[PDB]
């Protein structure tokens, strides 16, 4: 929808910049998610409302 609908190069520059920020973060996010999940892997206690 943007002003870069045309100019496919500059757009791909934007799109890859997006791909590079997400790639850098991807693991560190994943490992913190697994450490954050370490209590519910042991006992995922389920409440009556859940």
Minimal distance in Å, beta carbon 49 to another protein?
Answer: 10
Query: What is the secondary structure of 1-50 as a DSSP string?
Result: --TTSS-HHHHHHHHHHHHHHHHHHHHHHHHHHHHHHHHHHH-----S--
CA distance 15 to 23: 12
Q: Among residues 9, 26, 30, 38, which is the contact residue for a second copy, using CB under 8 A?
A: 38
**22 lies in the binding site for another protein (CB under 8 A):** yes
Tell me which residues touch another protein (CB under 8 A). 9-10, 13-14, 16-18, 20-22, 25-26, 28-29, 32-34, 36-44, 46, 48, 50
Tell me which residues touch a second copy (CB under 8 A). 32, 35-36, 38-39
């Amino acid at each position: 929808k943007s002003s870069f609908a045309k100019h496919p190069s500059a757009r791909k520059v934007i799109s890859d910049a997006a791909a590079t920020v997400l790639a850098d973060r991807s693991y560190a996010t994943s490992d913190g998610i697994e450490i954050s999940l370490k209590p519910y892997k042991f006992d995922p206690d389920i409440q009556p409302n859940e």
